[PDB]
From Swiss-Prot:
This is Inter-alpha-trypsin inhibitor heavy chain H1. The keyword Iron does not apply. Heavy chains are linked to bikunin via chondroitin 4-sulfate esterified to the alpha-carboxyl of the C-terminal aspartate after propeptide cleavage. It comes from Homo sapiens. Glycans are attached at residues 16, 241, 544. Keywords: Disulfide bond, Glycoprotein, Phosphoprotein, Protease inhibitor, Proteoglycan, Secreted, Serine protease inhibitor, Signal. Residues 246-406 form the VWFA domain. Residues 1-122 form the VIT domain. May act as a carrier of hyaluronan in serum or as a binding protein between hyaluronan and other matrix protein, including those on cell surfaces in tissues to regulate the localization, synthesis and degradation of hyaluronan which are essential to cells undergoing biological processes. Disulfide bonds join 200-203, 224-496. It comes from the Eukaryota. Coiled coil: none annotated. One of its GO terms (molecular function) is serine-type endopeptidase inhibitor activity.
Length: 598
């Protein structure tokens, strides 16, 4: 007896198609109302913030409804005069660090069969030597036909594949999770029977509460991974077996009074572990900034046994100092790294890295954020990346993102939680092992109509550089790529030519879906890139980039910060349509076939 109040979940299926890192999710739920009265049913699931919703369909006993994508402004016009805000009314809202919650409550007719189907897509990003697919399993009821099916197709070949279900006991997971891979194809199938979903042999609650994680990576023996299909290309670059570069790293740490407690404790703990794993060939220094700026050595020193132990002692010992002189702290760390230009030229071939951690905004010294941005980029001058870590939600993170974007880096949020130390270690490991610097992927100008970022300051072990673009007509056959870069005292250079015979073979093995996903891979990366650029440019160019992002979101039907998806045919208590948006940083619906005629 799975049903609750006469409503049972007949089926809940997650189908993920991955093609050359492009992940295409389709989640389909069919709920049946056996009661002779009307019942409220829910379609509730979590999706990753990195994905774009591309389609949503609801079919109730032949009565079909579909989400129409439109300019966000147009979709939210119904909210202006209304008593609820579009943020509160939307079906999608943020629910965690990396996930968003999609929720709709619908009153269905008696003896009704309703099918929900949500589609969302993303380009998987490699980190820590793998791609990771996370699917939140939470039906809140027993499901007669529950299934997760992940179908992976990687031209370069799959090197490893794993599937983990934390909510399942080790014994239950083994018999129930089927996985296998050979050559280019990988498959994971999870099809628990109703009995296997039960917490106890004869109880109704379901153990299916948790996350279903699928991880994999592709064979990297072949350094060229150039995929061309129907005037669009994707180029994946991650050479293996390269020698770790020696690096010069300066940590700029906020020691404001606000850090008192867990934050300073977790920060120190992370620095101790980072210092403990530093390699003998590296050089480093530490900068603390409160109201006053203070550097451990004032210059890059080698990661000797003595220096590392002295630094750990310095880390354990420092105390907080009231305010936050962020401008002074950054300029001090930059000044130290720039000594390599004049005083310490023997370190010039190392990969330089600047990491800054702060839990608040500048309050001492120069506090004009726009001036700080100017001061920082004029001091670094594109010589090394800057990685800003925002600790907590009492800081202007947009300010940190723009600064990193203007200086060949990225910003990362550290959530105030019991695991902040592990979060900090997690991030640092992404940048800990630089292998190449000044990576320049070059393509024939006569063949490229558009392409994503093709210059990358540093390439790190475990990560990957990806470039996508659109090819001009009749230039696909001869398309090629040249990649230049530098190691530590070395020059890197390769050439990748499209393998026409292989491309045709891939098209046969994966079908026209290969062509579609390569193009949609390009569109996804282009849209994300447009959203990143627009936040770090003047307001005039911002409007230009916004219109580009709006047009691409509409062309490919993505729910992005510039678009919304509305469902005609449904209305809440106030006659408002269901609306689906991409969040930044209750109500129940009924079937309604009428709307006021304009």
């Amino acid at each position: 007896d799975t049903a609750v109040d006469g409503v049972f979940i007949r089926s809940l299926k997650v189908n993920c198609k991955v093609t050359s890192r492009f992940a295409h999710y389709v989640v389909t739920s069919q709920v049946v109302n056996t009661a002779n009265e009307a019942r409220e049913v829910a379609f509730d699931l979590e999706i990753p913030k990195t994905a774009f919703i591309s389609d949503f369909a609801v079919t109730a006993d032949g009565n079909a409804f579909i989400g129409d994508i439109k300019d966000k402004v147009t979709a939210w016009k119904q909210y202006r005069k209304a008593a609820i805000s579009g943020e509160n009314a939307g079906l999608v809202r943020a629910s965690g660090r990396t996930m968003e919650q999609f929720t709709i409550h619908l009153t269905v007719n008696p003896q009704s069969k309703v099918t929900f189907q949500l589609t969302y897509e993303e380009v998987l990003k490699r980190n820590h030597m793998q791609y990771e697919i996370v699917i939140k399993v939470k039906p809140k009821q027993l499901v007669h036909h529950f299934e997760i099916d992940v179908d992976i197709f990687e031209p370069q070949g799959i090197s490893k594949l794993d599937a983990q279900a934390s909510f399942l006991p080790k014994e239950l997971a083994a018999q129930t999770i089927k996985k296998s891979f050979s050559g280019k194809k990988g498959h994971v199938l999870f099809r628990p029977t109703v009995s296997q979903q039960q917490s106890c042999p004869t109880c109704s609650t379901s153990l299916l509460n948790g996350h279903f994680k699928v991880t994999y990576d592709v064979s990297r023996d072949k350094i060229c991974d150039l995929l061309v299909a129907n005037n669009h290309f994707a180029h994946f670059f991650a050479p293996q077996n390269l020698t770790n570069m020696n690096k010069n790293v300066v940590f700029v740490i906020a020691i404001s009074g606000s850090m008192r407690g867990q934050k300073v404790k977790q920060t120190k703990e992370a620095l101790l572990k980072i210092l403990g794993d530093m390699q003998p060939g590296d050089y480093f220094d530490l900068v603390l900034f409160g109201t006053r700026v203070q550097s451990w050595k004032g210059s890059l020193v080698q990661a000797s046994e003595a220096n590392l132990q002295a630094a750990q002692d310095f880390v354990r010992g420092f105390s907080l100092d009231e305010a936050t002189n962020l401008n002074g702290g950054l300029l001090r760390g930059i000044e130290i790294l720039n000594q390599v230009q004049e005083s310490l030229p023997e370190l010039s071939n190392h990969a330089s890295i600047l990491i800054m951690l702060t839990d608040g905004d500048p309050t001492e010294g120069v506090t004009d954020r726009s001036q700080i941005l100017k001061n920082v980029r004029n001091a670094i001058r594109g010589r090394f990346p800057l990685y800003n870590l925002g600790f907590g939600h009492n800081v202007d993170f947009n300010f940190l993102e723009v600064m990193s974007m203007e200086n060949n880096g990225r910003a990362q949020r550290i959530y105030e939680d019991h695991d902040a130390t592990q979060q900090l270690q997690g991030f640092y490991s992404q940048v800990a092992k630089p292998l190449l610097v000044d990576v320049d992927l070059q393509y024939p100008q006569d063949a490229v109509l558009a392409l994503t970022q093709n210059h990358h300051k540093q390439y790190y072990e475990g990560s990957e550089i990806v470039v996508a673009g659109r090819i001009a007509d009749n230039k696909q056959s001869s398309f090629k790529a040249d990649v230049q870069a530098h190691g530590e005292g070395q020059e890197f250079s390769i050439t990748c030519l499209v393998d026409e015979e292989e491309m045709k073979k891939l098209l046969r093995e994966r079908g026209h879906m290969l062509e579609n996903h390569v193009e949609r891979l390009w569109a996804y990366l282009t849209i994300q890139e447009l959203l990143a650029k627009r936040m770090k440019v003047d307001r005039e160019e911002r409007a230009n980039l916004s219109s580009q992002a709006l047009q691409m979101s509409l062309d490919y039907g993505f729910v992005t910060p510039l678009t919304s998806m509305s469902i005609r045919g449904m209305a809440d208590q106030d006659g408002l349509k269901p609306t689906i948006d991409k969040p930044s940083e209750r109500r129940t619906f009924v079937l309604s076939a009428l709307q006021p005629s304009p």
